[PDB]
Design a protein around this ligand. Structure first.
Ligand code: UMF
Length: 124
């Protein structure tokens, strides 16, 4: 099995690169992180910051989650991220994505003890 915390790291953490990306960043990352196995995951964001910095967001600005829950948090500082959006011509299993880089405040949902990220909600 895989914990929600571990899944968040697999799906949304990529500290190995500051700005990372290459036009093919997402095409390679969505596949390597196994996000295209059961289907082409439509949208997924990778954060280029230390695990500590991202985990710390759980003690930052409390904001409402898109699903109505109250356990979401927004980072006070902007973070380097890469949004991966499935193209319109993408056809499983050959999932194709558009690699977009940006510097925004991330919003994640946190749960557990330790209180850590378990869902990436949005960026603003
Ligand atoms: O800015 C955004 C918005 C959404 N998601 C993607 O949307 C899912 C469905 O809520 C998420 O998976 P998750 O709950 O497994 O994190 C997230 F991964 C991102 O990666 N970035």
């Amino acid at each position: 099995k895989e914990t929600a915390a571990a899944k968040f790291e697999r799906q949304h953490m990529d500290s190995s690169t500051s700005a990372a990306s290459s036009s093919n960043y997402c095409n390679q990352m969505m596949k390597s992180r196994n996000l295209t196995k059961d289907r082409c995951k439509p949208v997924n964001t990778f954060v280029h910051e230390s695990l500590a910095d991202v985990q710390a967001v759980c003690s930052q600005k409390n904001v409402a989650c898109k699903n109505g829950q109250t356990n979401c948090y927004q980072s006070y500082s902007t973070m380097s991220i890469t949004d991966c959006r499935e193209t319109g011509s993408s056809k499983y299993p050959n999932c194709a994505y558009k690699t977009t880089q940006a510097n925004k405040h991330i919003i994640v949902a946190c749960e557990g003890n330790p209180y850590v990220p378990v869902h990436f909600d949005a960026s603003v």
